[PDB]
Write a protein that binds this ligand. Structure first.
Ligand SMILES: [Mg+2]
Ligand SMILES: [Mg+2]
Ligand SMILES: [Zn+2]
Lengths: 56, 102, 191, 133, 102, 56, 182
RNA sequence: AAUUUUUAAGGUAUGUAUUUUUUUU
RNA sequence: ACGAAUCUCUUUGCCUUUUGGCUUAGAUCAAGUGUAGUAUCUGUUCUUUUCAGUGUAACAACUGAA
């Protein structure tokens, strides 16, 4: 979903978008890292799998 | 048009109280020091018990008035707007803030 | 296979969607018997959403429609996304339009009520025993932990105002007189 | 008196518990500092405001109110010594000067404000400040 | 080692509750929504301005319009009545009936 | 166990009740094999006696 | 566990579940059990309100009606309607279970049947007249007789009433009050 | 051409009161 | 007319918890039936010409022609 908002000061929107791109990058990178870790067979525990598949 | 910075506002209120005070003086006309100890540097200033009681009464009175006027805006505020659905008072109050946002 | 929506169960959605928003559909079906979440959502999107357009058809639309339906053969979501209309409306005109060519909060509240009742009870006990002359002091709610404080017994953290040049020293006397006056009143007139 | 005593005690448990948790929220301090005023005990109330100046000394509603409770009961040289500490802490401010000036008007002493405006001009404040002098 | 599963239970009492109990809960909330949260007062309670002011609840549980003397089964019915042409008239009749006296 | 599972209850089960696995078949497996799974000859292990029984 | 169990579609179940409240009320006590039942009259589904109304009649017979009755006369005040029928239906049952007694308890219930026969909705005027049929037959020959003129004065205007379940209940009352008055 | 053995914890809450010799009007 | 005080009123301005966080939306789960019968809202039509019959406690209603 795009997340437009009615009247909100633009600079605040700039800030929020910036931090959400940071968090999105970390979220995706962990999604990939845990995934190759699972593929090669190394022990990924349990809910990291169940959590991973949601991310992917 | 417009908002006012907390400086100009302060000045305006200063003037307002000056006028009010001057009126107390005129109506009072119509109805009709520094010592510092040698032992300690503590300074003492002679005071009239009158005008101090008048001061306290002025502050209390103005607080009462302000509190009451705001209270009347409380009363009318909730009784005026019955248009949209509301679960509780707090909802209606918030949606009136949404009316202010327009 | 009916799953038919009465005007009551339509009126409860719009009040539920207003309350719970559009992604909590599992909660909307809690307010609404007979209907599951997949049934509630499907109606909100196909009918009841006030951002939907149910209106008559301009002369440009039937041109726009018969343009799309020809250029996209049966795909009625893709057309409807182009037309900004619900599909089953954009389909239903097109079939008629061809034949145009034809011939916690509660719990803590109640517990607080209980506690206040207990207080009231002990107070009126003490008053009744007083009426018979026997005087009994109130009890301290023990101590939860070792260092627990009794706020009445002492000034909690007394921050002296400061020294200062103007040397009050007299006003303190008038104050203490007023204070001892206050407590001396309460022992008799009792507020 | 126990109809009083346990009232005051139970309140001082509830207010401190909240302020214990939230150091900030000056809205509570002023309320709770007001409770101890209406009990006609100045010692406790002064402590509370003094306790609340540590949390934030830049919050003027707190500074102003603590001038009131001094002026209302007419403790003079306190609300006087206080203004030594008050405007030496936040010397730029507007409201703090005028509330110290205008309270000196109702005390009729113009020698004070004569020397007040001496410093407050020595500080080179600005337009609206000079015009009052 | 059944911790592998991931379900659990709290140690208190006996969970699910009885289908009849759910209906009581659900028919209160539905009458809270459609009512838009207002407390419609009982007829005997000796009058918090009402959203309207005519609707009440009798000594039984039913809702009643005190103008029209109609009895209503649910909030949904009431909104039918308040949006009806009879409850329109009785306001006009009381309109005239007041405008002829004070 | 394939027989009677369907009619246990329907609406009523609590989360654990419905989802969790029954310990009852594993108990059946360790009763049948008990005298090997519990045997005194063990390499390292300590005797206990149950409360009111003579079972070590 | 029984109070949940009388949702059952079977009857012999529902009937035996109500009988075992008498065996428990005799054991432990009536007031512990009533509050369990009276909390269940709020429930919507009819079997549950009728099968509680029976049980309150059964707890009355077994432990004595004086224990049950003022708790039921109080519960009648609640503004929900389903309670107010369930408290009038429970009183019908308990006056046919204590057959002869019933005379001790009149005079107390005449004001409770006063608001019932006066009430607007047609079902109260049905269940109170279904109390009078049980209360008249077996309290006839006692010498109350001035409570049944009161109770009569309130019924007769219901002679014009239609509805099938309402009108046969009122005739039963008028047939029964004939034996109290003559 | 040679493995290797087991104990705790995440499950049965937690909280409050309770045995006291009558503090001087 | 004017310096000017106090109460009442509108507006501008000021404004309240303007939702306690986090993850795989954190996860998952939900409505018995049949026979007889009443109660209660809303929508739609009529207060509009005479007489003759049916009908009603009396109306009403129904039935014909100018
Ligand atoms: Mg757990
Ligand atoms: Mg853990
Ligand atoms: Zn009405």
């Amino acid at each position: 979903i795009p997340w437009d908002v009615p009247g909100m000061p633009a600079p605040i929107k700039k800030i929020i978008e910036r931090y959400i791109k940071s968090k999105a990058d970390a979220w995706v990178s962990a999604a990939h890292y845990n995934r190759e870790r699972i593929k090669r067979g190394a022990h990924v525990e349990k809910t990291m799998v169940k959590k991973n598949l949601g991310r992917l | 048009r417009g908002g006012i910075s907390y400086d100009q506002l302060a000045k305006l209120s200063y003037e307002k109280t000056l006028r009010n005070l001057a009126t107390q003086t005129q109506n009072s006309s119509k109805q009709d020091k520094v010592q510092k100890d040698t032992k300690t540097g503590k300074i003492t200033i002679a005071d009239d018990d009158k005008l101090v009681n008048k001061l306290a009464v002025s502050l209390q009175s103005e607080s009462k008035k302000r509190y009451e006027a705001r209270k009347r805006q409380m009363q009318n505020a909730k009784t005026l707007y019955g248009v949209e659905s509301f679960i509780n008072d707090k909802n209606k109050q918030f949606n009136e803030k949404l009316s202010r946002e327009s | 296979k009916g799953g038919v929506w009465t005007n009551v169960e339509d009126q409860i959605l719009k009040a539920a969607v207003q309350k719970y928003g559009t992604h909590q559909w599992s909660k909307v079906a809690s307010l609404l018997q007979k209907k599951t979440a997949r049934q509630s959502e499907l109606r909100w999107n196909e009918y009841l959403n006030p951002k939907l357009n149910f209106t008559e058809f301009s002369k440009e639309e039937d041109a726009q429609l018969l343009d799309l339906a020809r250029e996209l053969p049966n795909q009625w979501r893709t057309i409807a996304d182009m037309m900004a209309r619900p599909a089953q409306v954009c389909v239903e005109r097109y079939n008629r339009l061809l034949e145009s060519e034809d011939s916690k909060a509660t719990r803590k509240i109640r517990e607080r009520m209980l506690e206040e009742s207990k207080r009231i009870a002990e107070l009126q006990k003490r008053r009744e025993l007083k009426q018979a002359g026997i005087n009994v002091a109130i009890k301290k709610p023990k101590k939860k932990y070792g260092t627990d404080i009794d706020y009445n017994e002492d000034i909690v953290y007394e921050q002296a105002p400061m020294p200062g040049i103007y040397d009050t020293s007299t006003e303190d006397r008038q104050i203490k007189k007023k204070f001892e006056q206050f407590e001396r009143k309460v022992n008799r007139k009792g507020l | 008196l126990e109809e009083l005593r346990e009232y005051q005690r139970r309140k001082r448990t509830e207010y401190e518990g909240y302020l214990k948790r939230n150091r900030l929220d000056m809205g509570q301090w002023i309320r709770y500092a007001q409770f101890e005023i209406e009990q006609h005990d100045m010692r406790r109330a002064r402590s509370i405001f003094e306790r609340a100046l540590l949390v934030d000394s830049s919050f003027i509603p707190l500074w102003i109110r603590y001038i009131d409770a001094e002026l209302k009961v007419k403790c003079i040289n306190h609300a006087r010594n206080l203004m030594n500490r008050a405007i030496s802490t936040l010397p730029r401010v507007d409201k703090l000067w005028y509330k110290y000036l205008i309270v000196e008007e109702s005390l009729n002493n113009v020698e004070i404000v004569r020397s007040l405006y001496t410093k407050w001009c020595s500080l080179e404040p600005g337009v609206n400040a000079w015009n009052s002098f | 080692m059944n911790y592998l599963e991931g379900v659990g239970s709290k140690k208190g009492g006996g969970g699910i509750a009885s289908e009849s109990q759910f209906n009581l809960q659900r028919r209160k909330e539905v009458e809270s929504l459609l009512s838009k949260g207002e407390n419609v007062p009982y007829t005997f309670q000796d009058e918090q301005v009402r959203s309207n002011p005519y609707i009440y609840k009798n000594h039984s549980g039913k809702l009643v319009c005190k103008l029209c003397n109609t009895m209503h089964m649910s909030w949904s019915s009431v909104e039918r009545h308040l949006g009806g042409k009879k409850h329109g008239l009785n306001v006009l009749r009381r309109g005239i009936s007041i405008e002829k006296s004070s | 166990a394939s027989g009677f599972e369907d009619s246990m209850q329907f609406k009523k089960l609590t989360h654990a009740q419905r989802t969790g696995l029954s310990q009852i078949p594993n108990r059946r497996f360790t009763l049948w094999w008990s005298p090997t799974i519990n045997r005194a000859n063990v390499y390292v292990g300590f005797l206990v006696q149950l409360d009111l029984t003579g079972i070590f | 566990e029984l109070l949940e169990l009388l949702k059952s579609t079977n009857k012999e179940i529902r009937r035996s579940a109500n009988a075992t409240f008498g065996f428990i009320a005799e054991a432990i006590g009536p007031h512990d059990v009533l509050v369990a039942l009276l909390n269940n009259l709020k429930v919507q589904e009819r079997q549950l309100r009728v099968c509680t109304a029976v049980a309150i009649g059964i707890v009355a017979k077994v432990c004595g009606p004086y224990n049950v009755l003022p708790v039921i006369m109080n519960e009648y005040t609640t503004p929900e309607t389903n309670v107010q029928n369930g408290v009038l239906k429970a009183m019908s049952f308990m006056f046919e279970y204590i057959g002869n007694m019933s005379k001790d308890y009149i005079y107390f219930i005449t004001p409770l049947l006063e608001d019932a026969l006066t009430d607007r909705d047609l079902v109260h005027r049905q269940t109170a007249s279904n109390v009078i049929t049980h209360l008249a037959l077996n309290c006839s020959g006692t010498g109350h007789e001035d409570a049944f003129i009161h109770l009569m004065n309130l019924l007769i205007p219901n002679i014009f009433e239609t509805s099938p379940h309402a009108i046969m209940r009122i005739l039963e009352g008028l047939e029964a009050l004939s034996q109290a008055l003559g």
